[PDB]
Scaffold this active site. Structure first.
Site, short mmCIF file in Angstrom:
data_model
loop_
_atom_site.label_atom_id
_atom_site.label_comp_id
_atom_site.label_asym_id
_atom_site.label_seq_id
_atom_site.Cartn_x
_atom_site.Cartn_y
_atom_site.Cartn_z
N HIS A 237 68.78 90.46 78.26
CA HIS A 237 69.01 91.58 79.19
C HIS A 237 70.48 91.70 79.63
O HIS A 237 70.77 92.09 80.78
CB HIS A 237 68.07 91.46 80.41
CG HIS A 237 66.59 91.47 80.06
ND1 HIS A 237 65.88 90.35 79.78
CD2 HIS A 237 65.67 92.53 79.98
CE1 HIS A 237 64.59 90.66 79.51
NE2 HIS A 237 64.45 92.00 79.64
N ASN B 72 59.04 94.22 82.83
CA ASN B 72 59.45 95.05 81.69
C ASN B 72 58.81 96.43 81.70
O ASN B 72 57.88 96.70 82.48
CB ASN B 72 59.11 94.35 80.37
CG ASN B 72 60.03 93.17 80.07
OD1 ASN B 72 61.13 93.11 80.58
ND2 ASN B 72 59.58 92.23 79.25
C1 HDD Z 1 61.89 80.45 79.94
C2 HDD Z 1 62.47 81.46 79.33
C3 HDD Z 1 62.12 82.86 79.65
C4 HDD Z 1 60.87 83.56 79.34
C5 HDD Z 1 59.63 83.11 78.65
C6 HDD Z 1 61.15 84.90 79.90
N1 HDD Z 1 62.36 85.06 80.46
FE1 HDD Z 1 63.28 86.69 81.37
N2 HDD Z 1 64.95 85.83 81.54
C7 HDD Z 1 65.20 84.53 81.30
C8 HDD Z 1 64.32 83.63 80.83
C9 HDD Z 1 62.96 83.87 80.33
C10 HDD Z 1 66.64 84.10 81.63
C11 HDD Z 1 67.32 83.54 80.38
O1 HDD Z 1 66.68 83.08 82.65
C12 HDD Z 1 67.23 85.39 82.21
C13 HDD Z 1 68.60 85.82 81.64
C14 HDD Z 1 69.56 86.16 82.80
C15 HDD Z 1 68.78 85.71 84.00
O2 HDD Z 1 69.18 85.68 85.16
O3 HDD Z 1 67.45 85.28 83.61
C16 HDD Z 1 66.09 86.39 81.99
C17 HDD Z 1 66.31 87.71 82.20
C18 HDD Z 1 65.29 88.73 82.47
C19 HDD Z 1 65.61 90.06 83.02
C20 HDD Z 1 66.92 90.66 83.46
C21 HDD Z 1 67.09 90.54 84.96
C22 HDD Z 1 68.37 91.28 85.32
O4 HDD Z 1 68.40 92.54 85.17
O5 HDD Z 1 69.36 90.60 85.74
C23 HDD Z 1 64.30 90.70 83.08
C24 HDD Z 1 64.03 92.09 83.61
C25 HDD Z 1 63.40 89.64 82.53
N3 HDD Z 1 64.01 88.50 82.16
C26 HDD Z 1 61.94 89.76 82.43
C27 HDD Z 1 61.05 88.87 81.67
C28 HDD Z 1 59.65 89.30 81.40
C29 HDD Z 1 58.93 90.56 81.82
C30 HDD Z 1 59.17 88.18 80.60
C31 HDD Z 1 57.83 88.02 80.05
C32 HDD Z 1 56.86 87.74 80.91
C33 HDD Z 1 60.30 87.25 80.51
N4 HDD Z 1 61.44 87.67 81.12
C34 HDD Z 1 60.18 85.98 79.80
#
Ligand code: HDD
Ligand code: HDD
Ligand SMILES: *[C@@H]1O[C@H](CO)[C@@H](O[C@@H]2O[C@H](CO)[C@@H](O)[C@H](O)[C@H]2NC(C)=O)[C@H](O)[C@H]1NC(C)=O
Ligand SMILES: *[C@@H]1O[C@H](CO)[C@@H](O[C@@H]2O[C@H](CO)[C@@H](O)[C@H](O)[C@H]2NC(C)=O)[C@H](O)[C@H]1NC(C)=O
Ligand SMILES: *[C@@H]1O[C@H](CO)[C@@H](O[C@@H]2O[C@H](CO)[C@@H](O)[C@H](O)[C@H]2NC(C)=O)[C@H](O)[C@H]1NC(C)=O
Ligand SMILES: *[C@@H]1O[C@H](CO)[C@@H](O[C@@H]2O[C@H](CO)[C@@H](O)[C@H](O)[C@H]2NC(C)=O)[C@H](O)[C@H]1NC(C)=O
Ligand SMILES: *[C@@H]1O[C@H](CO)[C@@H](O[C@@H]2O[C@H](CO)[C@@H](O)[C@H](O)[C@H]2NC(C)=O)[C@H](O)[C@H]1NC(C)=O
Ligand SMILES: *[C@@H]1O[C@H](CO)[C@@H](O)[C@H](O)[C@H]1NC(C)=O
Ligand SMILES: [Ca+2]
Lengths: 671, 669, 356
Positions: B56, B129
């Site tokens: 994202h 999402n």
């Molecule tokens: C354990 C790993 C992992 C898993 C399985 C998921 N995510 Fe995630 N997600 C992250 C690890 C992550 C992250 C790598 O920690 C991020 C990247 C930047 C942040 O702050 O969190 C992230 C970013 C992130 C953002 C951007 C937030 C922003 O605008 O700053 C959204 C909207 C989502 N995620 C939503 C989801 C949804 C709906 C998932 C399915 C249920 C999902 N993620 C699974």
């Protein structure tokens, strides 16, 4: 290099493990804190990214070698240049300037061309651009240039583009930018590939001989693939259809044994000639025209190896003008001077720590002897337990290197200073307009139209009336004609002619469209528009393929669906993917209100018409070829339009069009 | 907020200074190390960038507010939901998934919709999402999904796209992805704007009441702007013509007083119903069909204020599902569980330090009382010199908060565990195919064609023959027909029908093209193609403008050059910039070359608009005839031909509501 | 400095337990290295590298020192033939959780009642120490509690101490002028355990590397000869010998100026230096230093001795009892060493410390 083609999965400390299911308190239970397999893997993931480069974030690199043509002891002490046929490994990274990572390759920008020579006397970096002059005259102004050129800080709009108020506000208030601005507004702003552009050191440097004497120099990397550029309307589409165009091109050229090449050349002049050309040589907004100093070919640079891991090699490479070797020295160019500080400081941001020179891609190929110690990510274990100078306890080692011992780097001894400490600009830097004009005068009339059109495009997207007026004011000082023609698009009166800097001088070698045919057509892309209805169509294709592939071209046969002999579908195809386009006779049905659920309406014709309108060699190959063109609305007699029955004669004719590359007669000029 | 509209330039410590020329040893001499003005400025610049988000990275944000519709104490203890008309400030960031921070908004991807409620009981984040289900069933797999989906690690190609070997290798080997994959291949992969898409929490969560009881829930944010999406061939061009499209759109909607809105809704079911719908509610690859649990509208979310500094607000916002409040709890969804760890850890990467919650955008709107101390970038000066528990020297403050004191968060007491510690997947998670089929069945026949076409597009870019076959195998398990039609484009035989999971069940509300006309057309964009030759042309334009602008539309008059009444030139114009296109009668000459725009541009715009399914029209007398020249059928749906300005608008505005005219797209046979 | 340990660094054959302290540790040690190293690739530091190959899909991160050849770093893949393979109980010798381990009941933030006895084991520990060891422990506590400024805190400390041993509370309370609270015998008992006592663990099994200081002088030529002879003997038995005098020269390792009793395990005065121990001062060391070293050594329980003829008399001047345990009086160099070396093994002479 780490091999993972066989074996069981291990943690980073070598303990065999799995990574597919979390450890849970019961089959439908919560995950456990004690699941170290989980946390080590996710922590790594969570921490994969590093800050992108403050500028030139979008780029690509390759490994190659540099070969010296001679022993250049007569001009420089530089060891990588001290013997005929001497071979130094290199790494090069090309880039745009303004876009973040993930922005399209084919935005309009200045381009980076950064070369590392891993010499046997240290790493030597030439960090340059595809344009020989820069926007500004003092490094302290860099953030102002860059802030204004990058996206607006309130909403982060627009990505990778000068087409907005702030950039032109800056350009119009900082006239020093006219020269580079003109270059960027030419085809130089949108090269056909990294391979079809040159490299320039921009600044004047010094060559230095063991006797301590110095000449002033300018680096030029001349492309052996020739100069070529896209047309705007094509570049915009390409940015959408393939953001990765330039990097895919370079990767492909290298995979297929067509490594690109450049002649590494210098202009050499005397210290006395600092002001002998009607401008200050410490001014990075000026060129020495080839007429007043010819180029000397020093050696050959060739890229022939792709990296194995992009992040580890391309993303992590950290260039520095501060990476200098014995035989070269700096000049008092106030832009170059500031660069020296910035490139050392910024790697702390990117690497998060001080031992960035220990990354494999940044390591030298010779031993390291110094008293730098500790810091995060320290990868060496130092044996010398007396890391100070002067010492007796390590017998005064490592020894001081200088002019007369150890082949130390040394400042040109001739260099002197005088006067007051001042934060003042030299009056000798004050002519911001002549050279842009020189540049404009040196372009073909179509090239000039294109440049006007680029400016028309951008200025019309500048919301502010006042800013548009100030832009016209500056443009006018370079050329009243240009101001008039540009002003016409934005509905304003160009101001009255001001001839202080007008002149008719021309210079050679700055024109793309006027540089004659390409010296090679190897690696250029030909699309062949076929069909799976007529069995004849695919046979025509197959024969063109054998003939065209034999001359080093890259051939794509397009049809409705994939099968043996078909490389891609009409659905995934576009004119921007090709340097020339051929319709085989048997496909005429497709170009005539016919539709298919296998591609969007009008696609096959759209590809062809686009190719034609963008100035590309287009042709029909076969019997009824006369007639497929009148349906397409493409003139049979037109330059670079090809109509023949003889396959052997078609190729031969077409390959001439590919070398001409762009057919400029299809573009309207002003009146 | 820091104001710089007046004053003299200062250093960061307030000493007045200049910043335009370096300090040099003589007017033509070298720069001096002692030039502190230079170094402070360049150091700042050299260090401006932070790592982009691991996923994202490309997104944009806005401020707004949420209003509760009721006192929801009957379902949850959550304070922001405890009173009719209760307002909580919010901040939302929308994003794509795969692309780095400079990639186009209109790549085909899943989309992020992340919401922060700055409640009076702490910050509460719903990180969701635009698609209600996710590719994988266990967080531990997230790096596998993301590695395969992002560019290839050798050359970093392709940007922002699933159209390469590794992605489909993964999708074909990890069948759990079918459901999301189908969604992403639909129009859900390419929404018309952030405003025209929904938000979903994906996982089942729990509502928890003060008495300790829990219901299972699913969050839905329903768009009050309606659902709309681009067509692929249009999206591709838009990516080049305007990488910033979605963010531009959201910014503009808010500047013009048309802040987008969503009904914040839940599905509420009982703990006993965990397996009562023919799938496990802990499985984030499944939806509860609306047929079996209706949505309850909880309140209204509205965005109405743009940020002041993008970096400081949008780039630095740091969401976490760990940001939970009293009244909500997690479930044993193995995907959700892992996310809890990740989002706390990753902010160290982004912020470079542990004090990220002290950034203005991340701060709560209530006091903070705890024993966290020190760390780089510590911005508080703590008065309590006994930061341990238990203490007497600070009278046992701060006090422990839990179920019965201090309104503490608490885990739902009903939650229990049993059995062995296992790294094994529940058998209840094993059906990867039915729900994708349910999804596909519920789309209109054209929507189905588009989805097949998206799949044909991508699979044809997969170089490896073996991977293509494995893709067909998986697709076939969802629908033989789909496999067959997709296989046709890549020249392979679809494997023989396998009906284990085939069925004809449909669900409501998942279709875009079948969701009826838009409930509003305010902010939609209309391009008027005019000319500076005929004086009549610009008069026609000006009159259309007054009429159209009156109905909340955004109007652009295009001509060869700029002047009063003209917003942009043919040079800078393109069909992707408009929701509908109007040619004024007086411009007919142009549609039948100029140095002021590329050859054929004016007609290209119109023809493109028509071919992409947009409302197109000619307004004027010889309108009858401009269409036959353009090769656009006068009688065709959403093609408009009239002389009466008042009647033209009235007709055209109906086309804008229909938004896309699906009769112009070929179907399979 | 860079070594980064982790209990998460576990191998096939060992597993964790549900100890709520151990459980949390697992999180902390992985997280903190991010602080210390400033980046995620800390396992790539030479000291933290394993001695076997690494196969996984971890990529990138600041300070990435590898160049990975596998361009399909995801699972499941076919494009790298399903490599690297999952390792578990039955393949690749994977780590695996003990399969016996089970869980049951509610999710709770509550302490197990089985953890509630905080006092018996301390008592067990105290009972198992020699009486002097006990005095020392009381004295350490007396030292610390008397530096605690708050009256209320001191009282609460006595309360807790009392629940382990009323005696201990009484003795400690004596130093801070408070009444110990009334005996509470819920956890009192007389159980002992072996191996937790230092002073009661008998002589050291080796005296190699222990440090002996020899206090000599540069006036009497005899003094340095005595030293040199002690040196040869003592160094032969693996001891580390320092000969101290007013100034440095051949045979002298350090000056009285830089010398102190804390630098030695035992102390020997050679006979020829008696003048130094008797109101005499020098600009080469602080007043009283030579005697201060000796008297300190004695008072701290160390083996002290005079070696030579007038040894009988140097002690009465020093106020050190000639007959006292671990005080050594002899003329025969060979028999002095032999006696002294027994004192070094006993290491501490506990009879010199007052009890309550
Ligand atoms: C354990 C790993 C992992 C898993 C399985 C998921 N995510 Fe995630 N997600 C992250 C690890 C992550 C992250 C790598 O920690 C991020 C990247 C930047 C942040 O702050 O969190 C992230 C970013 C992130 C953002 C951007 C937030 C922003 O605008 O700053 C959204 C909207 C989502 N995620 C939503 C989801 C949804 C709906 C998932 C399915 C249920 C999902 N993620 C699974
Ligand atoms: C005073 C600041 C400053 C100024 C005046 C310049 N640069 Fe720069 N440049 C930087 C500060 C900088 C930097 C922020 O320090 C970068 C960004 C990432 C990096 O490592 O160094 C950089 C990156 C960078 C790169 C990317 C190298 C790579 O691929 O890693 C190239 C090719 C150039 N520059 C070339 C130039 C040229 C030809 C200039 C005009 C003569 C120039 N820069 C002026
Ligand atoms: C420096 O030495 C090189 C070494 O040959 C000279 O380069 C050659 O010059 C000769 C004589 O003019 C030419 O015939 C060749 O074209 C050059 N050979 C190559 C391989 O480049 C160079 O001219 C010398 N320059 C100076 C200033 O002394
Ligand atoms: C060209 O450069 C190389 C590198 O400096 C020179 O070879 C070095 O010469 C010194 C003696 O001056 C030796 O101590 C080193 O062992 C050599 N270095 C290496 C890497 O082999 C070479 O002599 C130079 N040629 C000329 C003509 O100057
Ligand atoms: C919880 O309380 C709310 C507060 O009114 C209820 O919402 C109303 O429900 C009735 C039907 O039962 C409707 O007539 C109202 O229009 C609803 N109002 C709103 C704003 O939704 C809700 O039904 C109650 N839910 C439960 C499960 O008891
Ligand atoms: C709704 O929201 C807040 C939740 O905190 C409540 O207001 C608080 O009420 C308690 C009384 O029990 C006070 O101690 C807090 O100081 C109040 N805080 C604020 C910010 O006003 C309110 O009680 C809740 N309403 C209902 C109906 O449950
Ligand atoms: C298709 O729809 C039918 C009708 O609801 C589903 O069958 C029901 O499933 C529910 C939940 O498992 C059961 O409680 C009922 O016993 C079934 N009812 C009837 C009337 O048959 C079926 O599960 C759906 N199939 C799929 C694959 O979604
Ligand atoms: C133009 O060219 C001539 C010859 O090179 C030179 O003498 C004259 O000074 C030049 N003037 C400018 C402004 O470039
Ligand atoms: Ca750091």
């Amino acid at each position: 290099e780490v091999d993972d083609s066989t074996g069981y999965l291990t943690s980073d400390v070598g303990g065999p493990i799995q990574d597919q299911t979390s450890l849970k308190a019961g089959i439908r239970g919560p995950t456990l804190l004690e699941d170290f397999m989980f946390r080590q893997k996710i922590q790594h993931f969570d921490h994969e990214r590093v800050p992108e480069r403050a500028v030139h974030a979008r780029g690509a690199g390759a490994h190659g070698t540099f070969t010296s043509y001679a022993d250049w002891s007569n001009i420089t002490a530089a060891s990588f240049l001290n013997a005929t046929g001497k071979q130094t490994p290199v790494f090069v990274r090309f880039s745009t300037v303004a876009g973040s990572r993930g922005s399209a390759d084919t935005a309009r920008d200045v381009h980076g061309f950064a070369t590392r020579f891993y010499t046997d006397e240290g790493n030597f970096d030439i960090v340059g651009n595809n344009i020989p002059v820069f926007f500004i005259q003092d490094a302290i102004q860099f953030p102002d240039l860059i802030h204004s050129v990058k996206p607006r800080p309130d909403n982060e709009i627009p990505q990778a583009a000068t087409a907005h108020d702030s950039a032109w506000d800056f350009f119009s208030q900082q006239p020093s930018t006219m020269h580079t601005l003109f270059w960027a507004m030419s085809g130089h702003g949108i090269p056909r590939s990294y391979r079809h552009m040159d490299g320039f050191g921009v600044h004047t440097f010094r060559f230095v001989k063991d006797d301590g004497s110095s000449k002033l120099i300018k680096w030029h990397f001349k492309s052996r693939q020739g100069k070529a550029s896209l047309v705007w309307e094509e570049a915009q589409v390409l940015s959408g259809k393939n953001a990765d165009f330039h990097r895919q091109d370079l990767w492909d050229a290298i995979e297929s044994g067509n490594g690109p090449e450049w002649d590494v050349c210098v202009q050499i002049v005397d210290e006395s000639q600092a002001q002998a050309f009607g401008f200050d040589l410490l001014d990075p907004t000026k060129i020495i025209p080839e007429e007043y100093a010819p180029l000397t070919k020093l050696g050959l640079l060739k890229l022939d190896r792709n990296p194995t891991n992009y992040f580890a090699e391309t993303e992590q490479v950290m260039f520095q003008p501060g990476h200098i070797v014995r035989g070269i020295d700096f000049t008092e160019d106030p832009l170059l001077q500031g660069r020296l500080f910035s490139y050392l400081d910024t790697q702390l941001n990117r690497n998060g720590g001080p031992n960035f020179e220990q990354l494999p891609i940044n390591m030298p190929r010779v031993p390291i002897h110094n008293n730098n110690r500790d810091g995060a990510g320290q990868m060496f274990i130092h044996r010398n337990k007396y890391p100070y100078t002067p010492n007796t306890l390590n017998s005064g080692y490592p020894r001081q290197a200088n002019q007369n011992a150890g082949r130390g780097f040394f400042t040109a001894p001739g260099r002197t200073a005088s006067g007051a400490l001042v934060r003042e600009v030299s009056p000798t830097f004050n002519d911001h307009w002549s050279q842009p004009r020189l540049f404009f005068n040196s372009l073909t009339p179509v090239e000039q139209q294109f440049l006007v059109n680029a400016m028309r495009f951008e200025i019309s997207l500048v919301k502010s009336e006042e800013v548009k007026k100030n832009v016209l004011t500056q443009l006018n000082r370079v050329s009243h004609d240009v101001a008039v023609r540009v002003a016409a698009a934005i509905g304003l009166g160009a101001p009255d002619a001001d001839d202080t800097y007008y002149h008719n001088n021309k210079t050679a070698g700055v024109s793309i469209v006027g540089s004659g045919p390409l010296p090679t057509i190897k690696t250029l892309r030909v699309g062949i528009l076929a069909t799976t209805s007529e069995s004849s169509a695919l046979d025509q294709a197959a024969q063109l393929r054998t003939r065209l592939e034999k001359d080093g071209l890259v051939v794509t046969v397009v049809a409705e669906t994939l099968r043996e002999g078909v490389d891609q579908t009409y659905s995934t195809a576009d004119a921007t993917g090709f340097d020339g386009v051929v319709v085989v006779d048997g496909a005429a049905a497709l170009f005539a209100t016919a539709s298919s659920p296998l591609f969007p309406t009008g696609r096959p014709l759209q590809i062809f018409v686009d190719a034609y309108r963008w100035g590309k060699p287009v042709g029909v190959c076969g019997g009824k070829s006369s007639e497929v063109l009148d349906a397409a609305d493409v003139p049979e007699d037109g330059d670079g339009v090809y109509s023949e029955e003889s396959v052997d004669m078609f190729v031969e004719e077409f390959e001439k069009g590919l070398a001409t590359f762009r057919f400029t007669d299809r573009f309207a000029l002003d009146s």
